[PDB]
Amino acid sequence: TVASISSGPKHTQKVPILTANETGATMPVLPSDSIETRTTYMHFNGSETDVECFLGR
Amino acid sequence: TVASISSGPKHTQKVPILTANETGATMPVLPSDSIETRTTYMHFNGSETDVECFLGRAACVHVTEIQNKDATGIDNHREAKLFNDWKINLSSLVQLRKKLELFTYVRFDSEYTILATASQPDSANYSSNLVVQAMYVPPGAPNPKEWDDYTWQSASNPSVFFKVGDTSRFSVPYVGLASAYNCFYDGYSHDDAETQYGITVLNHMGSMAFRIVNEHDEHKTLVKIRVYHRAKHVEAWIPRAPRALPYTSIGRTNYPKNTEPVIKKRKGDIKSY
Amino acid sequence: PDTYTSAGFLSCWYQTSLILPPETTGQVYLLSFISACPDFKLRLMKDTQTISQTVALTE
Amino acid sequence: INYYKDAASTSSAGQSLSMDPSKFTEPVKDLMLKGAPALN
Amino acid sequence: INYYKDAASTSSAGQSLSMDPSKFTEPVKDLMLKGAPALN
Amino acid sequence: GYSDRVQQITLGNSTITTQEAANAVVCYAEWPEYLPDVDASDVNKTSKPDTSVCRFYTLDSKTWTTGSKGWCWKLPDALKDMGVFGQNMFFHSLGRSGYTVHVQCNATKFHSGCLLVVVIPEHQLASHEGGNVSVKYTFTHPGERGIDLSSANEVGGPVKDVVYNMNGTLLGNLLIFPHQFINLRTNNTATIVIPYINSVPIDSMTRHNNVSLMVIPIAPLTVPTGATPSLPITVTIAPMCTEFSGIRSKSIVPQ
Amino acid sequence: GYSDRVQQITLGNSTITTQEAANAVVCYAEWPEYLPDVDASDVNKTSKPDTSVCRFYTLDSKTWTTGSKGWCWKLPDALKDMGVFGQNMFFHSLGRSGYTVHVQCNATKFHSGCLLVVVIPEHQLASHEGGNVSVKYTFTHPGERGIDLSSANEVGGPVKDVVYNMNGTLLGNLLIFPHQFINLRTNNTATIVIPYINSVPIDSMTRHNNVSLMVIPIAPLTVPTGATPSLPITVTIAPMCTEFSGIRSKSIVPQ
Amino acid sequence: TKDEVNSYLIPLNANRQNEQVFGTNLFIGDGVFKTTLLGEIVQYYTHWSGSLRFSLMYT
Ligand SMILES: Cc1cc(CCCCCOc2c(Cl)cc(C3=NCCO3)cc2Cl)on1
Hints:
This is part of a larger assembly, with 2 copies of chain A, 2 copies of chain C (about 60 residues), 2 copies of chain D (about 40 residues) and 2 copies of chain F (about 260 residues).
Chain A lengths: L1 E3 L5 E3 L27 E2 L9 H5 L2
Antiparallel strand pairs in A: 1-3
Chain D lengths: L21 H4 L15
Chain F lengths: L6 E5 L2 E5 L6 E2 L30 E2 L3 E4 L5 E5 L7 H9 E13 L7 E10 L25 E2 L30 E5 L5 E6 L16 E12 L7 E18 L8
Parallel strand pairs in F: 3-11
Antiparallel strand pairs in F: 1-2, 4-13, 5-13, 6-9, 6-12, 7-11, 7-13, 8-10, 8-12
The structure holds the ligand Cc1cc(CCCCCOc2c(Cl)cc(C3=NCCO3)cc2Cl)on1.
């Protein structure tokens, strides 16, 4: 799984960082929408935040 | 496997025993390069020198003590040993320390065994049966102030309840921040001019807290806790020179002043046997 | 909060400046939100400093 | 191996490995595409 | 047989049976052959 | 006619020639390489100045005399002020690097003396005070000057006792670390290639030094009769495969 | 729903969003690119710091008032002190770069005013003295401050007369240079991409500026009634495709 | 000085130039962040890693 993909300079008409929060959504913006990133992998599953785990001790 | 091959007289232009140590290599010279040998087999694998084996037996890492007594009128439970803590560290005791410091970075799961025995140094009718409660307060967790706090509820904190005289055992994954535990660290927390130096700044994984669940009987009971640690699934990188001088502190390399010569002086000459 | 492990600072400044239309006055406000990216990992559960108690609750 | 007959007696469940934040993060009626204008 | 779910809970690991001292005993850039002269 | 003995290292816009080498050591048999994605964590693209940072900087020279105890430099500290390497260093949040170290000391066939040149990964120093006294920052960041083991104890500084490696271990066992000797009779330089060694993929270049280079006279310098009793030792070091990441405002560090 | 109007430029670790753009100009219809071998002369491998130099630096802000005559910045001068761009600049013998220039000025639908934003390749200034008086170095290297055309003549400085472009040509014809207007009623930013334009493949970054960016009020600022009579103008500029070559000691320049 | 709806509002002043609107460190488990849902959950765990999304809505 990639945690971040590689992304480079941008000069577009397509701006993912401008939104309207009045709508009630949290738009899924990522580091790679606003800086230049390199690939990295997650190495993690989110196992210990499962509700079974959270309420299970 | 052969430990030595058979080899006979030599009169060559090819001399394996002359080398240049300035290069930094240790050339792999064998008995058969300089005497006449006979075949012999190894009969041995080097099993018990594997690092998993070397670091894999339980070592005592900590001895603490708590007492069961009437807390009535005690203004500071922590201070009355109504309950104590051990700010998790493996540098306390030096037996296991020297072994670990043979490497720079080390990675392993831990298996803890906790033995608890009771003592009744002054007149008691009997020996009571107490139940110990060991809870690991992760850093950033409500620290027990009292001995029957709300913290002891440990609803999200892994805790174990066992009887005095008995032993408790469990194992923990490697909870290191990095890819491995730093046995040494030549750096600081941040670019300060007074900030501490060493690993004592890197190894901040909270502390363990013990206490006796039972209320107080008429006499007082001393319970002494011994924590044992066994590394399992060991991985070690970059060997270093063994520790020669005595240790003075958890987490610093410092040795004591006016220490004694560590190399044994000859009783005789260089020429002596 | 821990030093070695610290993450930085966040600041905000006028790039040019706020300009109100005529017939208008005073301060305007920004609302600010925080949420985690899908990137995020949390591990090693423990107890929160955010809640405590001194006696058991009754009905 | 379950040693007991009733389901309540089995150990903890196993990770949902479900995970879908959109019911919480994007409950909007008309779909919003990242990059397209929020309000048209 | 593992009785437990997590990997940390398994017993000790089993012998590397890896063993390669050359990273420590011969980290030289140009390979040295035993028997050939050290410095040419 | 290639000898182990003559060598040329060209790195960037700078070249070194030695006509009296004794092979070269590559720490742990690994050559410096950039940071692979599979090992990456920070999502930032990194900056690789290449030839402007990966060239040879020659630190100021030392003087070996019959009384010398040895000198110690820390990396990347020693280079904190060299050209653009240094700027990059103070300006990014994180950086990573390997090095080629070339230590030089020539004499004549009548001199004797032998230096140990060793690289120690994570050399945490000891306070000469004992107990749990710390070693202040400035003291472990001598810069190009390095630490002079025959200088006096100072307050907040490290201990400078040679037979204990500045940490409670014996001089004799330093040989377990990548090292090479300079024996006037054999050798005139020592060269060690250092791959990046850390427990994290990239780190801060200012709060943590990841190797100390140490040059220690072991067989005392002995000059021919009525020769001047000393020789200079020069250290030239080149960052290699350097990468910087997390650019910003420019660190301010004590002193 | 894409408009010519909203835009995002992400370059390095910095991003700009405009919700009121008027397209963008790319000088001479060419986009910045690195130096091809077929065009190369110096044999040195060049250094391409990439993301550490190719990000957006925002110069200090100006204040447009009813009396403003216009401001002038020179490149690469204006950036001579920005982060690692600047260091690289003083440390290499030669360097080359293109830029993205983003000029910002917002107001309200009651204001009026119109700025010309123009890039002039090789803008050789005139001495206000006439004859063959030269314009001293310092005067043509104002740094981030730029030149303020409504400041007074100084000695050894350039002339600051606007209807003559600081060189004997009329303001009206500046439109032959890549340019864009900021008309409060339309526009709130101007963006120009500048490819590297020179008669040599790479040059010195300190003895020669290769473009002047000029922002000139043309229709005077007119604020609504009882509004404060002024607006700030901000200039943010990002080097793009930068390459440095011939590294060494670090130039020392007048003043 | 007492919790109020007003500590959610970052004020902005018309006509200021060059100046600073707000500042904060990023200790997500403490300080401003601490009572937010993110802050509040982070506190059930010991370690965190990942990207954060900080947005500002203008009013
Ligand atoms: C190096 C190095 C390695 C370690 C070990 C760190 C210990 C990590 C935390 O370990 C524990 C966990 Cl996860 C749980 C418990 C525990 N749970 C119930 C009772 O005790 C105790 C410990 Cl020490 O320290 N320095």
